[PDB]
Paper text:
Phosphatidylinositol 3-kinases (PI3Ks) are lipid kinases that play pivotal roles in a multitude of fundamental biological processes, including proliferation, survival, differentiation, and metabolism. Among the different [name] subfamily proteins, [name]α is the most important isoform in cell proliferation in response to growth factor-tyrosine kinase pathway activation. The gene encoding the p110α subunit, [name], is mutated at a rate of nearly 30% in human cancers, including colorectal cancer, glioblastoma, and gastric cancer. Therefore, [name]α is a potential target for anti-cancer drug development.
Here, we determined the crystal structure of [name]α in complex with the potential inhibitor YXY-4F. The final resolution was 2.97 Å, and the Rwork/Rfree value was 23.1/28.0. The structure maintained all five p110α domains and a long p85 SH2 domain in an overall triangular shape. The crystal structure of [name]α–YXY-4F verified that the compound YXY-4F bound to the ATP-binding pocket of the p110α kinase catalytic domain. YXY-4F was anchored by multiple hydrogen bonds and hydrophobic interactions within the pocket formed by residues Ile800, Asp810, Tyr836, Glu849, and Val851 on one side and residues Met922, Ile932, and Asp933 on the other side. The morpholino oxygen accepted a hydrogen bond from the amide of the hinge Val851 residue. The fluorine in the phenyl moiety also accepted a hydrogen bond from the Ser773 hydroxyl group. The hydroxyl group in the phenol moiety formed two H-bonds with the Asp810 carboxyl side chain and Tyr836 hydroxyl group. Additionally, van der Waals interactions from the surrounding hydrophobic residues, including Val850, Ile932, Ile848 and Pro778, significantly contributed to YXY-4F’s affinity. Other interactions, including a divalent sulfur and π system, were also observed between the thienopyrimidine moiety and residue Trp780. Ser773 also moved to accommodate the distance between the phenyl fluorine and the Ser773 hydroxyl group to form a hydrogen bond. Collectively, these data suggested a significant shift in the conformation of Ser773 and Ser774 when compound YXY-4F was bound to [name]α, which indicated that the p110α residues Ser773 and Ser774 in the ATP binding site induced the pocket to adopt a different shape after YXY-4F binding.
Residue numbers in the entry:
A (entry chain A): 8 to 227, 248 to 308, 320 to 410, 414 to 504, 516 to 862, 873 to 1055
B (entry chain B): 322 to 598
């Protein structure tokens, strides 16, 4: 709401105006009024009250009040109306302003974008936080100097980057759709202020450069090509087919409509933004870690309290363990079992590990656990993780207090080593007191030069060794056989000893690095020192393989540092945008706030506004989550400070969503028992108001920032049937060439349900599609837009001309009859082809991922024949629990209704040429995803710390291993897939016989 | 007797179960806890020995060549039972000094047989339906408590900020008293002389109105602190209720899993299982 306890104050309200003479003037206000309007009415009435003579003119003063987030905000922008101020209570203090006015407006705008004040970061004691804020500005200034180097073309490249594919080469089936390798393209040109349009139809090669397309248009330096409908430009000199708009038009079979526009006109429209550096920009005895001759021991002093029922629980205790990522470095140690009434221990727990053998990324994972014929169930009450070494390579010492976190929903593990490190900011919380040893004031982890020194010394005692012995053929084949194992396929102890024995030979097959790293004794400084040297000069690998080394099982700084440098060299901005969801979630696994990955992502976010858009929203969506609020908030502060003019565009988006949150909260809470018609009246009445009309019109779509959302078609806006009250919203496309692409932009707003699962599922579908198109299979999937923007707050893209199955049906032949009418004539074959190809990809895609059961409302069909799915509520068969099946179910079962459409009105739909042709497409598609199984496992492994119930552990990710059948042979996996389709179809799915 | 036992009848042999099913059984188990399964049909080797050591699962492949089994060449054991029972009575330090541990605790496939003593299939099938309904009851009960747990945690966080927002307001309203007390002393003292009580009547009326608002705002902040302690007690109360259901959810799941595991044996039809579940 806009006022604490309320949502909106109806115009007639009183406000306590506090003057600098001492008086308190009550004043009648309206909700629409601006500050200079109220300040005119205040100083009008101020003369009645005493001590008027010492008051100055209105122009010298400024309003001040407390906001919803407890900040003393100074309202410089006096055009801001009263309901948009976000006040705590209706009062307004006038004073004379001080300090840097340019900084204070920027800090409030950054604070509004992030969702918390910038002053909250200033009050942080932790030096890691303040070092981050200072040091990260090095990347920010490096980013702006990059995009201002080749100005003003590089200025335009930041704001309007070329949305292109990774590789310029076309697949064969894409190239064959062109006429002798040429596309027919139309370039529109505006005539004058009169606003008439004239087209220039061209016919050119698919690999032409935008400059050469402009050279052909002038027949039919100065100009640049803009996409009609979007705010998307072809500035860079790529092949014309490499752009996603042109590549889509070839597949869809549409005329690409470009707009001729002046280069001087766009360059002048750019902001030419600024980046000001903010205002915050006895001797110690240092001992080395490897000098300490002592085993690790940690004292658990006491736990303050824990929410336990004394009757139901038998005992409580403190479980602890030393962890390198997910792997325990030694045996987990527990405290003595004490009563729930008095949680107190005071005992030195001895861990079987030598302090020098502790690796750089070693972590103390701990929890308070409850206990319940000599059988007992152990359960976690609260959890917490501490990094043994801090961000400056210093080992922890002395006493420290750790406020523990609530256990995540569904986590039955006693410890949570995957979760974030650091104390809970909420102090009204279970607090475990513990004490580490104190040897010196500062115990440091050694430098790389010292590690190399020990590494050479280590291999010397073991019995140029790379080329001393000769690598045999039997050994060379085994290295290939081990590299073919998927990430979660566990290497054996023979294979670990083999991989380590041939660690020097492993450089010849550099994709074996993740297998080689799992073979290292991380509880042994000898082997880690030797691995550090190999990792230093390791041959670089393909970005998709390097993303494995950023998951929770690879916490070492050197291993991660290598992985980030592979992305710097070989990750395209296409594939960065593709995999951005997973790379943002990976930041949760990082030990420290400052790291090589966040610097890489922040630089790419500030040199590419398309990447920076989603980088903002993926971070902003999780700001409610206190496990990552500080990390993500500080990171957003870096972006919002340095991103330039786009912060103003983001605030218009942020303000638009918050107003849609306010109305849907009222509908869910206050209008719960009202009818949907009366709710629509209330909705329309509030949306009609000017503060809502200004906020919810003239801003960029969060689903795609190229899409401009103009005026609301408020009559066509609706509330949906669900109990969470989703809003079916409808905007005009205000672009001058809208009709060629699309006139109206429809988005389903949503406040109750979680859309991270659909966002992931739709990302995976897009990747699955991209694998098939590259391989040769033309299986048209429809990964529609879906972005999560908050705590169960998200947007969904509406597909035009899309109908559910139950709409068409409400007899088995009804679906085939509808599709024949919509595609009546000689274009019937293309519609059945598209339907069959669409069915195949979604039949395979849903089986692998294990999405919720497909009914007629979940399945949808388009006019052209493209089938697609909606509502991926759960996945990886999350409802295997709440039940007891080990079976891999088939969600999308093709009934008689669907088989008739593939078979073209045949009686025996399961025994035709078209169905057998359909079967082969599913088999080729299934094996295509099986061959890229590592990519998907890596992508899911990066999401384990996200907080989704469906992805908490490696047990949950193992569903795709069962459906793809990675432990089995390729042929056995295909025979498995055939049997699963046969069981679901009750014999209808024909066997190889 | 021991070595002459068949590999099928051995308690520690589990057949073609997945590596995930092995990970479930060895989760939070003691050192030397082990079982044997079939090897991956992609990879070389016949069986896989998974055992615990240092809180970690250790996969050791058992190969075969010409009537002999073992971990590496040369293969010296007659059967897999001879290989296992040898390392049940002797350390694996013989094979590899790294993992100095014996095969102490076999994870039996007759483990469920100890718990579910009832022989009849239909009787066990009925208890699975009963245990599943008791599990689903407490599952829906737990979800309802977690819905409250999140909603309560949110509203506490809304209130916690609002308390600080009240305190900033009170600081400003008390700064307004300081603003009055500062500039009123000079003007009231000039007007106490000259016999102008009409001036003091308006100023002291305005001063009382300021203190009246401070009293109300401090009362509103005081009333909010009672709602915070009230709602914080609900958070603690809900967390106690969930931590009592937590262990019941594990046992009801684990027991039902054993009853399902028992019916996985003796080839019970999938149709019957879904009707019971
Ligand atoms: O990614 C998703 C998730 C969910 N689940 C939530 C939900 C549940 C009930 C409900 F009535 C609406 C939404 C729904 C949709 C979803 N999408 C729809 N689409 C309209 C056509 O374009 C694609 C999106 C429609 S049209 C009528 C219902 C509906 N639901 C998409």
């Amino acid at each position: 709401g806009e006022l604490w306890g309320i949502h909106l104050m109806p115009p007639r309200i009183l406000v306590e105006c506090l003057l600098p003479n001492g008086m308190i003037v009550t004043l009648e206000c309206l909700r629409e009024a601006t500050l200079i309007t109220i300040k005119h009415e205040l100083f009008k009435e101020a003369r009645k009250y005493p001590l008027h003579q010492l008051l100055q003119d209105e122009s010298s003063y400024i309003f001040v009040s407390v906001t919803q987030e407890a900040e003393r905000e100074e309202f410089f922008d006096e055009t801001r109306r009263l309901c948009d101020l976000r006040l705590f209570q209706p009062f307004l203090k006038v004073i004379e302003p001080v300090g840097n006015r340019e900084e204070k407006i920027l800090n409030r705008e950054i604070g509004f974008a992030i969702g918390m004040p910038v002053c909250e970061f200033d009050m942080v004691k932790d030096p890691e936080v303040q070092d981050f804020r200072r040091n990260i500005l090095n990347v920010c200034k490096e980013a702006v100097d990059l995009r201002d180097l080749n100005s003003p073309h590089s200025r335009a490249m930041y704001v309007y980057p070329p949305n292109v594919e990774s590789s310029p080469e076309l697949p064969k089936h894409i190239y064959n759709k062109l006429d002798k390798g040429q596309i027919i393209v139309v370039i529109w040109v505006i005539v004058s202020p009169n606003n008439d349009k004239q087209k220039y139809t061209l016919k050119i090669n698919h690999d032409c450069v935008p400059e050469q397309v402009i050279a052909e248009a002038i027949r039919k330096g100065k100009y640049i090509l803009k996409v009609c409908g979007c705010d998307e430009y072809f500035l860079e000199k790529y092949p014309l087919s490499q752009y996603k708009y042109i590549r889509s038009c070839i597949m869809l079979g549409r005329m690409p409509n470009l707009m001729l526009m002046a280069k001087e006109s766009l360059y002048s429209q750019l902001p030419m933004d600024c980046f000001t550096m903010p205002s915050y920009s006895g001797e110690t005895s240092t001992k080395s870690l490897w000098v300490i001759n002592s085993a690790l021991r940690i004292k658990i002093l006491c736990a303050t309290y824990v929410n336990v029922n004394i009757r139901d629980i038998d005992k409580i205790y403190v479980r602890t363990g030393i962890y390198h990522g997910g792997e325990p470095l030694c045996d987990n140690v527990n405290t003595q079992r004490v009563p729930c009434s008095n949680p107190r221990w005071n005992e030195w727990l001895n861990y079987d590990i030598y302090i020098p053998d502790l690796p750089r990324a070693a972590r103390l994972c701990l929890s308070i656990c409850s206990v319940k014929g000599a059988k007992e169930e152990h359960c976690p009450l609260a959890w917490g993780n501490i990094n043994l070494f801090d961000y400056t390579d210093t080992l922890v010492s002395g006493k420290m207090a750790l406020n523990l976190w609530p256990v995540p929903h569904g986590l039955e593990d006693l410890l949570n080593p995957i979760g974030v490190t650091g104390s809970n900011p909420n102090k009204e919380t279970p607090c475990l007191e513990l004490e580490f040893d104190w040897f010196s004031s500062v115990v440091k982890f050694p430098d790389m030069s010292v590690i190399e020194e020990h590494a050479n010394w280590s291999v010397s005692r073991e019995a140029r060794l790379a080329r001393d012995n000769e690598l045999r053929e039997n050994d060379k084949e085994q290295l290939k056989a081990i590299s073919t194992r998927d990430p979660l396929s566990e290497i054996t102890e023979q294979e670990k000893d083999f991989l380590w024995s041939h660690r020097h030979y492993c450089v010849t097959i550099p994709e074996i690095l993740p297998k080689l790293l799992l073979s290292v004794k991380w509880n042994s400084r000898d082997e880690v020192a030797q691995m550090y040297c190999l990792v230093k000069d390791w041959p670089p690998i393909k970005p998709e393989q390097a993303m494995e080394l950023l998951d929770c099982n690879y916490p070492d700084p050197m291993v991660r540092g290598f992985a980030v440098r592979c992305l710097e060299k070989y990750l395209t901005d296409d594939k960065l945008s593709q995999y951005l969801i997973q790379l943002v979630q990976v930041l949760k696994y990082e030990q420290y706030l400052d790291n090589l990955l966040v610097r890489f992502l922040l630089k790419k976010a500030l040199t590419n506004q398309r990447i920076g858009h989603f980088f903002f929203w993926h971070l902003k969506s999780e700001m409610h989550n206190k496990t990552v609020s500080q990390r993500f908030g500080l990171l957003l502060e870096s972006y919002c400070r340095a991103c330039g003019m786009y912060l103003k565009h983001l605030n218009r988006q942020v303000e638009a969503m918050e107003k849609l949150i306010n109305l849907t909260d009222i509908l869910k809470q206050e209008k719960k028992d009202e009818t949907q018609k009366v709710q629509m009246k209330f909705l329309v009445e509030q949306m009609r108001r000017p503060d809502f009309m200004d906020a919810l019109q003239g801003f960029l779509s969060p689903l795609n920032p190229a899409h401009q959302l103009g005026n609301l078609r408020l009559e066509e806006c609706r509330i949906m049937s669900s109990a969470k009250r989703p809003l079916w919203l409808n905007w005009e496309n205000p672009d001058i060439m809208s009709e060629l692409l699309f006139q109206n932009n429809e988005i389903i707003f949503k406040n109750g349900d979680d859309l991270r699962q659909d966002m992931l599922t739709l990302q995976i579908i897009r990747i699955m599609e991209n694998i098939w198109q590259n391989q040769g299979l033309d299986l048209r999937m429809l990964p529609y837009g879906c972005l999560s923007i908050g705590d169960c707050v998200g947007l969904i893209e509406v597909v035009r001309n899309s109908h559910t199955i139950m709409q068409i049906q409400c007899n088995s032949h009804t679906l085939h009859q509808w599709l024949k009418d919509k595609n009546k004539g000689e274009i019937y074959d293309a519609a059945i082809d598209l339907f069959t190809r669409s069915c195949a990809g979604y039949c395979v895609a849903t089986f692998i991922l294990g999405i919720g059961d497909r009914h007629n409302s979940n399945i949808m069909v388009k006019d052209d024949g493209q089938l697609f799915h909606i509502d991926f509520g759960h996945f990886l068969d999350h409802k295997k629990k709440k039940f007891g099946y080990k079976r891999e179910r088939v969600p999308f079962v093709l009934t008689q209704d669907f088989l008739i459409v593939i078979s073209k009105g045949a009686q025996e739909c399961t025994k035709t040429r078209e169905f057998e042709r359909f079967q082969e497409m599913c088999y080729k598609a299934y094996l295509a995803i099986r061959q890229h199984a590592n990519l998907f496992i890596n992508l899911f492994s990066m999401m384990l710390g996200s907080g989704m119930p469906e992805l908490q552990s490696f047990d949950d990710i193992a569903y795709i291993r069962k459906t793809l059948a990675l432990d089995k042979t390729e042929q056995e996996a295909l025979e498995y897939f055939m049997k699963q389709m046969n069981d679901a179809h009750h014999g209808g799915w024909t066997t190889k016989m | 007797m021991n070595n002459n036992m068949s590999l099928q009848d051995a308690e520690w042999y589990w057949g073609d179960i997945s590596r995930e099913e092995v990970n479930e059984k060895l989760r939070d188990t003691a050192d030397g806890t082990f079982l044997v399964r079939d090897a991956s049909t992609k990879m070389h080797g016949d069986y896989t020995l998974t055992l615990r050591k240092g809180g970690n699962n250790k996969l050791i492949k058992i190969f075969h060549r010409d009537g002999k089994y073992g971990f590496s060449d040369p293969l010296t054991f007659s059967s897999v039972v001879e290989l296992i029972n040898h390392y049940r009575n002797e350390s694996l330090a013989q094979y590899n000094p790294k993992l100095d541990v014996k095969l102490l605790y076999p994870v039996s496939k007759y483990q469920q047989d100890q718990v579910v003593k009832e022989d009849n299939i239909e009787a066990v099938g009925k208890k699975l339906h009963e245990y599943n309904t008791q599990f689903q009851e407490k599952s829906r009960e737990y979800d309802r408590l977690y819905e409250e747990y999140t909603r309560t945690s949110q509203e506490i966080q809304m209130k916690r900020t609002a308390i600080e927002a009240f305190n900033e307001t009170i600081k400003i309203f008390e700064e307004q008293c300081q603003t009055q007390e500062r500039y009123s002393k000079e003007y009231i003292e000039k007007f106490k002389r000259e016999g102008n009580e009409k001036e003091i009547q308006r100023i002291m009326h305005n001063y009382d109105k300021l203190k009246s608002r401070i009293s109300e705002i401090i009362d509103s902040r005081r009333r909010l602190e009672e709602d915070l302690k009230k709602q914080a007690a609900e958070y603690r109360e809900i967390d106690k209720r969930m931590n009592s259901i937590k262990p019941d959810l594990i046992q009801l799941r684990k027991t039902r899993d054993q009853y399902l595991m028992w019916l996985t044996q003796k080839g019970v039809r999938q149709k019957k299982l879904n009707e019971w579940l």
